[PDB]
Symmetry: C2
Subunit: 342 residues, 2 copies
Amino acid sequence: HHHSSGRENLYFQGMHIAIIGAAGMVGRKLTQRLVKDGSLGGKPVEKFTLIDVFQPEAPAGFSGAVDARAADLSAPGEAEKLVEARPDVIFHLAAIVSGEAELDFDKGYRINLDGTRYLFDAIRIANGKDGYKPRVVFTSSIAVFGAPLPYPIPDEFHTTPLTSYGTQKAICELLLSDYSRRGFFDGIGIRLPTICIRPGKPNAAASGFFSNILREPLVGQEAVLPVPESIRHWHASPRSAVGFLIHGAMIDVEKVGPRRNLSMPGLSATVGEQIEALRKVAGEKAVALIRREPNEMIMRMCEGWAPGFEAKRARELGFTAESSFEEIIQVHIEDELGGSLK
Amino acid sequence: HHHSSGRENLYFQGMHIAIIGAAGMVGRKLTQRLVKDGSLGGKPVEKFTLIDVFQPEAPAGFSGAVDARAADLSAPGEAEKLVEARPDVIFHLAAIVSGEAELDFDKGYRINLDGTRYLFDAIRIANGKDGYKPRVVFTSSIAVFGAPLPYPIPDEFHTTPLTSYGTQKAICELLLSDYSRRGFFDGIGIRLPTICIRPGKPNAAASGFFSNILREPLVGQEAVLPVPESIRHWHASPRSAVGFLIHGAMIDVEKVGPRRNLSMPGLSATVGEQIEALRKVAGEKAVALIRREPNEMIMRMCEGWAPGFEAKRARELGFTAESSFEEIIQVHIEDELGGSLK
């Protein structure tokens, strides 16, 4: 045909998405969501570059270009190699976890700070060469905050982390805002809450109990509760975490303004409230699977875990998360357990 | 003699002080004060290592060891060379100024961030080798803050700098707290206010007028005022700036706690208030030397200059500064003009 009466295409030109830390729980779920959605929001996903220290799997049901490989962003030339592929959106999710960063000073700074700096500089240099200006969505963390902390923590509260991991994230945030301001890329920092319920198997992190006391009982398994019911912490589901990333990739950076690092919404809840939600949703017999076995070493660490945030700016900007533990538990049942406890 | 009835020595063993940025206005005045005092507070100063990109002068009236040389902390091996000399106290004052850092992305990050990181890592490595654990007093800046800012700015207000210089300082602050926590050195970050009155000659920085409109009239010279009287900014004298450094070198780090970066006291004042102080102290004829010549480019920048701070923690910890512009002007007359306008 010859006659058109206005815009015709559903879609713009396709886009290339890169995910660093693609083999982690968040990265895999992000990849899966992007495949399912097909586009972001009006650009079809034409290619994934998927990088992690552990080999990422090519996503099932995706028919576009895939470059999935095991690589360390901190290693010589790797940042440049990614940037030469000119991805339109870069999700930077990779980090060595706090427990590891605390025990290995060098490794944490190398992977969590230097690797990020190398990526940011490779982008900067390409921006200078040919105007390359990608969307960069970086996962920061509530670990950027350190005690003493008010409850709730306001948007303007300073970052005084008491871990090297939190320090590394806080520095990456500052670099992200400065490079964004100077126009090298369009950066958005996403400060993830604790992910609850974390799917899979009990991870040895002192804080694993926040998920263990729900995840295991929901499948008829026992779990240890090492702390008292009054302990208060700040949470969002894996679904929500992924939602933050999708939203951050498309948000108008002019609405965000120069303060590009955002405290995400989530839920402040006590351990007692988690258990009551488990009782309501899964029943007395599930709650009965929780073994109260005090551990004074974990209890001492509760002081340094953030109680909760106002998240005012992020909510105004359209980020959303769960508002009850019943919701968190429902998300887990729907997303991990096939919608049924049988 | 043979009999002692208690402690006898005024002084402990001598100490070695290093000053990086020693040839700058603050560094030279710091050196001079330390020579005059003779000790800190009970350790005689036995040696100065004085380093700056411009050759520092050996201080007059000092009889101890002097190692004064032109060097760049960011250059290969320089950080290690300083640390091999094992100074007891390190005053890290060096930086390329914001105007330069903004126009030269690479140079600012190299000198203001990387050089500091190299120093901190050289100390860390020595701490691992032989327990070397110096006092490190770092000059940060109110440049770590960026608009929109409340007046006054509370101690817990986040660092969202809108310059690369402020970004570099904010990152150095975070590194300083983390290395201090991990026990590599005893770090204290000193966030300097604007120095007023800055001695010498009009510096071309857009903000030079804050000093120019007092300094020049006090010696019968004209000065341009490019902004309206309502403009509000946050100031301390050179004497006070030096006082912060002396205090920071000796303060009990346990009283400071893990948040090692401190907003200094100072004075919030309008331009009108500066002029009224000049009128009171120097008279109508001095005020008459100020030429009101609006400059819309400087005026636009006033928005991004910090109005004033609470400085609650720093005042509780014994840091002090001027509380009126009459005091600031009196300090300038005493310290720069021989106590007299003739």
